Amino acid sequence: NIPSWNWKEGDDAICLAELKLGFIAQSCLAQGLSTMLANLFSMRSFIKIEEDTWQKYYLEGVSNEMYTEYLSSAFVGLSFPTVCELCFVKLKLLMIAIEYKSANRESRILINPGNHLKIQEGTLGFFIASDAKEVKRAFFYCKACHDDITDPKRIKKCGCKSNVKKYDSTGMFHWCAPKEIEKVILTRSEAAMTVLSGHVVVCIFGDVSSALIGLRNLVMPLRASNFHYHELKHIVFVGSIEYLKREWETLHNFPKVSILPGTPLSRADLRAVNINLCDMCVILSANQNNIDDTSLQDKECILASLNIKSMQFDDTTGVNIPIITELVNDTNVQFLDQDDDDDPDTELYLTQPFACGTAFAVSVLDSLMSATYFNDNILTLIRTLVTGGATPELEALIAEENALRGGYSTPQTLANRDRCRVAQLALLDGPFADLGDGGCYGDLFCKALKTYNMLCFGIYRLRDAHLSTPSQCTKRYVITNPPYEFELVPTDLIFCLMQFD
Amino acid sequence: LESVSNFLKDFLHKDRDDVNVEIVFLHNISPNLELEALFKRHFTQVEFYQGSVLNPHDLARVKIESADACLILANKYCADPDAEDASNIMRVISIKNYHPKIRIITQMLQYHNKAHLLNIPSWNWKEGDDAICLAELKLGFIAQSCLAQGLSTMLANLFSMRSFIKIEEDTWQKYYLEGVSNEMYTEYLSSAFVGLSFPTVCELCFVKLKLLMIAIEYKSANRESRILINPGNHL
Amino acid sequence: LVTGGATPELEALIAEENALRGGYSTPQTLANRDRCRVAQLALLDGPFADLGDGGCYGDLFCKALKTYNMLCFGIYRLRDAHLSTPSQCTKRYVITNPPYEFELVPTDLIFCLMQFD
């Protein structure tokens, strides 16, 4: 509303709730993605680890950061997968997104564009690299001068020149007709005989006086029209029904929501939602207003997490259940994973629960607060990658009524949902199974990008993978952008940005 | 002030004979009034650490690893019993995280909260990690007082150190204090008692050894040996 | 002794739903309630009435344990018992584990751990 507030000039605002809930939701689709994104923008000192432990592999990807650089003139007229492969193989740079100008609006940030669209002269690609000088070398890349590149040091400055409401008005998100809370509320028995599986459970610690968490920002990314209707993950809220009634009017437009009126700490409610086989579990609190006990706000969250972990089921233990916990204090992260305590005085990123992605801290956004000063575009890329869209015109349309209005299926609407969705794939039974064991990461990335136009992201390697002892621990840690020569075991998940079909 | 006044008066009552002092103490809001209202009931012994229970550096300051136990006291006078219990569980969790191998004893204000201690993987109640629920036991003593009036007083004197004072006057106080000095202990039964029914060995202990045996442990090879209160002649 | 049971498995079952769920009568269930209950008995009209007056505590305890398998606990002696004045006060005080030679008046209650039948 401010006439002089020009976001194009650089005036951008960080919404702490928008981005926190978006990272949490993207963690549901890809476990550990919040930790991976956290290290892309925070300065974190690299410490060499001589021991063959998970910490060394984790810190290998921590030093990698995210930068923006204009693409060279040699890349004009080339498809995104080809230039991405050239940058990765030759320049050792991983390009994620670019800007496409349609001469109708502002150049949107296209996450992993396909081969349908080419690259114009004025493109500012987003790259991931440990240092900054490597990213700069992509600006003056010469195809003729640098045709043969034995090592990346060769490149230098010198060179040779129906009427059914299915989606919203813009089609960016799934939409459904508004429904009264009585259509989605349910009792223990109604939950217990429901066949829901691979769903998302969200436990809320909120009361009449607690503040709104703003759960809309948690629901929108989970259904951003990039997933099929059957592919959408069901969301079940466990908490006080009075609190849910406060902000239900902002969530009644989504197809798959359900609410169970009950305490998150109650084991009966969690068993009735069938949390044993749920795809993801999230713990949120809304009582951050309490002034007493400075380091005690994240009190019920750890109790709920331990209750979930220390819960048995009849055909197993609940430790294997993936849970995401919101922590307001970085000094209570170690209380989550009570299986390995290397040292009580440990860095937040080096802590195992944070590295595994099972714990998230709002402290992380205070670092994004700096990354947008040093590079203005980083916040826009993170927002468009996490929110799954949320164009400024869509933001305006939402602002005009504080709600989502359903649209109609039109050719432009159907073509609008052609972006990429964050997901994880395993090599145990996938097409790359032959490359799962004893295969270089770079070869796998090149094969995936050349075949399925899939941008192979970092590796969510299992913690007990390097050790030869058959450990039964299922906890895994994220490795951000492993090098070309890096090798991965078959029992490793890999993040990806899948296309739409 | 009250909690430490009643704890210290029993822990260091001088009726334990073969014991040391120990008590290190730890708090976060300091002993502002405690130092004038009572000090620590000793000057040379019993110290006070101004560091918190949650901070690992302060927990290292007390050398918790070298302690025999941590004892966690709770304010019965809390506004929210659930909050106080969850804070004490958070304390238990921090202590166990710093050192998995340590005995912890803990006051719980509500019974349903004791279940959360069993969620901690290193919390082994068989090793000795047991929690005292103040409401569980208070209401239990009150209820047992309904069945047997005065049972709460009898059980209170079985475990509290209380000095024995001789009363020459023929009053009820002398008879009452006669049974106050009696305390409760645990001892392994002799090999001569193996294969004998509980009433017979109890009679032998009472008549000969002047000892009153109440309960024993029976191992069924299926679970932990339960505490059988006055077993019959069947077993 | 106080909770009248409360086994750790039962505590876990209670913790799993924060409530009690009714079961069914089974031979193991019926045999489970074979423990002892705390109670009080008087010697005014009980089987030990002949031993109520001028009787040693130890003899009473031995007789009870040998006959009814009843663990004779301490004596809830009336406060105005030693005094010869016929006081009308009904207040009593607990005596914990009186010795073998201790003698009790007939108007005294005794704690006990009765069996089940």
Q: How far apart are the first and last CA of chain A?
A: 38
**DSSP 8-state class, residue A211:** P
Is A443 at the interface with chain B, CB within 8 A?
Answer: no
How far are the Cα atoms of B4, B6, B110, B111 from residue B138, in angstroms, in the given order?
A: 19, 17, 11, 11
How many contacts does A have with C, using Cβ atoms within 8 A?
A: 8
Shortest distance between the Cα of A313 and any Cα of chain C, in A, equals 11
The size of the B-C interface in CB pairs under 8 A is 110
Cβ proximity of A142 and A76 under 8 Å: no
Q: Determine how many CB atoms are found less than 10 A away from the CB of residue A44.
A: 18
Q: Which residue has the tokens 């799954």?
A: A388
**C-alpha dihedral (C58, C62, C68, C72), degrees to nearest 10:** 30
Nearest alpha carbon to residue A108 among A373, A374, A390, A368: A390
User: What gap in Å lies between CA A495 and CA A456, rounded to an integer?
Assistant: 6
All partners of chain C with 3 or more CB pairs under 8 angstroms: A, B
Burial of A161 (0-12, 13-18, 19+ CB in 10 A): exposed
Q: What residues have CB less than 8 Å from A66, skipping those under 6 apart?
A: A40, A41, A126, A127, A128, A371, A378, A381
- DSSP state letters, B18-29: S-------B-SS
Across the interface, which of B90, B97, B118 has its CB nearest the CB of A338?
A: B97
- Which residue does chain B place closest to C78, by CA atoms? B172
Q: Which residues of A292-323 are buried (b: 16+ CB within 10 A; e: fewer)?
A: eeebbbbbbbbbbbbbbbbbeeeeeebbebbb
Partner-chain contact B116 A339, CB within 8 Å: no
Residue A108, helix vs strand vs coil: strand
Cα A185 → chain centroid:
29
Sign of CA dihedral A248, A251, A255, A257: negative
What are the φ and ψ backbone dihedral angles of C42, each rounded to 5 degrees? Answer: -110, 150
Give the span between the Cα atoms of A381 and A363, in whole angstroms: 20
**Taking CB atoms and an 8 Å cutoff, what residues of chain B touch C3?**
136, 140
For A335, the closest of B57, B93, B100 (CB atoms) is B93
Q: Which two tokens stand for residue A118?
A: 């080419």
Residues C33 and C19: their CA atoms lie apart, in Å, by 20
- Tell me which residue in C69, C82, C96 faces B232 most closely, judged by beta carbons: C69
Structure tokens at B123: 């919390």
A226 near A500, Cβ under 8 Å? yes
**d(Cα B152, Cα B145) in Å, to the nearest integer?**
6
Interface of A with C in 422-451 (CB under 8 A): none
Distance (Å, whole) CA B5 – CA A279: 53
Instruction: Please indicate if any CB of chain A lies within 8 Å of the CB of C9.
Output: no
> What is the identity of the amino acid at A314?
D
Nearest residue on chain B to C114, alpha-carbon basis: B230
Tokens 């923008």 belong to: A41
Which residue in B151, B228, B232 is closest to C38 by CB distance? B151
Q: Which residues of C touch B229 (CB under 8 A)?
A: 1, 35-36, 113
d(CA A155, CA A66): 20
Type of residue at A64: N
Asked if A317 is an interface residue toward chain B (Cβ–Cβ < 8 A), one would say: no
Binding residues of A: 334, 337, 340, 342
Give residue A153's Cα distance to chain centre. 33
Residue C15's closest chain A neighbor by CA?
A: A267
Q: Which amino acid is at B161?
A: M
Which residue of chain A is at minimal alpha-carbon distance from B118?
A: A310
Give Cα A50 to chain centroid, integer Å.
30
- The rounded distance, in Å, linking the Cα atoms of A235 and A200 is 5
| CA A170 vs CA A415, B48, B50, C17: distances in Å | 11, 66, 60, 46
- Enter the tokens of residue C48: 């030990």
Nearest to B178 among C15, C95, C111 (CB): C95
Contact check, Cβ <8 Å, C3/B136: yes
Report CB contact under 8 Å: B182, C111. no
Count Cβ atoms within 10 A of the Cβ of residue A224 and give its class: 0-12 exposed, 13-18 middle, 19 or more buried: buried
- Chain C contact present for B82, CB below 8 A: no
Tokens of A100: 């496409």
Bridge partners (DSSP) of residue C112 are: C39, C72
With contact defined as beta carbons under 8 Å apart, do C101 and C54 qualify?
no
Residue B128 CB contacts under 8 Å (≥ 6 apart), including other chains: B103
Chains near B, with 3+ CB pairs < 8 A?
A, C
Distance CA A394, CA A387 (A): 12
Q: Which of A173, A142, A172 is nearest to A157 (CA)?
A: A142
Q: Would you tell me which residues 237-266 of chain A have a C-beta closer than 8 angstroms to some C-beta of chain C?
A: 266
Instruction: Characterize the bridge pairing of strands A359-361 and A257-261.
Output: unpaired
Test mutation, A267, A307, A311, A314, chain C, max C CBs within 10 A: A267
Q: Which residues of B touch C111 (CB under 8 A)?
A: 148, 151, 154
Which B residues in the span 200-229 are in contact with C, Cβ-Cβ below 8 Å? Answer: 202-203, 206-207, 210, 212, 214-215, 223-224, 226-229
Q: Which helix (H) or strand (E) holds C11?
A: helix C8-17
- The nearest CA of chain B is from the CA of A233 a distance in Å of 29
Residues A446, A83 contacting (CB under 8 angstroms) = no
Do A37 and A221 contact (CB within 8 A), yes or no? Answer: no
Burial of C65 (0-12, 13-18, 19+ CB in 10 A): buried
* A32: its two tokens: 């550990």
Closest among A90, A68, A94 to A80, alpha carbons compared:
A94
Chain A closest-CA separation from residue B96 CA (Å): 9
What is the Cα–Cα distance from A354 to A333, expressed in whole angstroms? 7
Distance CA B26, CA B52 (A): 7
What are the two backbone dihedrals, phi and then psi, of residue A370, each rounded to the nearest 5 degrees? -85, -40
**Which chain B residues are Cβ-neighbours of A303 within 8 angstroms?**
86, 89, 116, 119
Mutate to test the interface with B, among C97, C110, C113 (most CBs of B within 10 A): C97
Q: Does C95 sit within 8 Å of B175, measured CB to CB?
A: yes
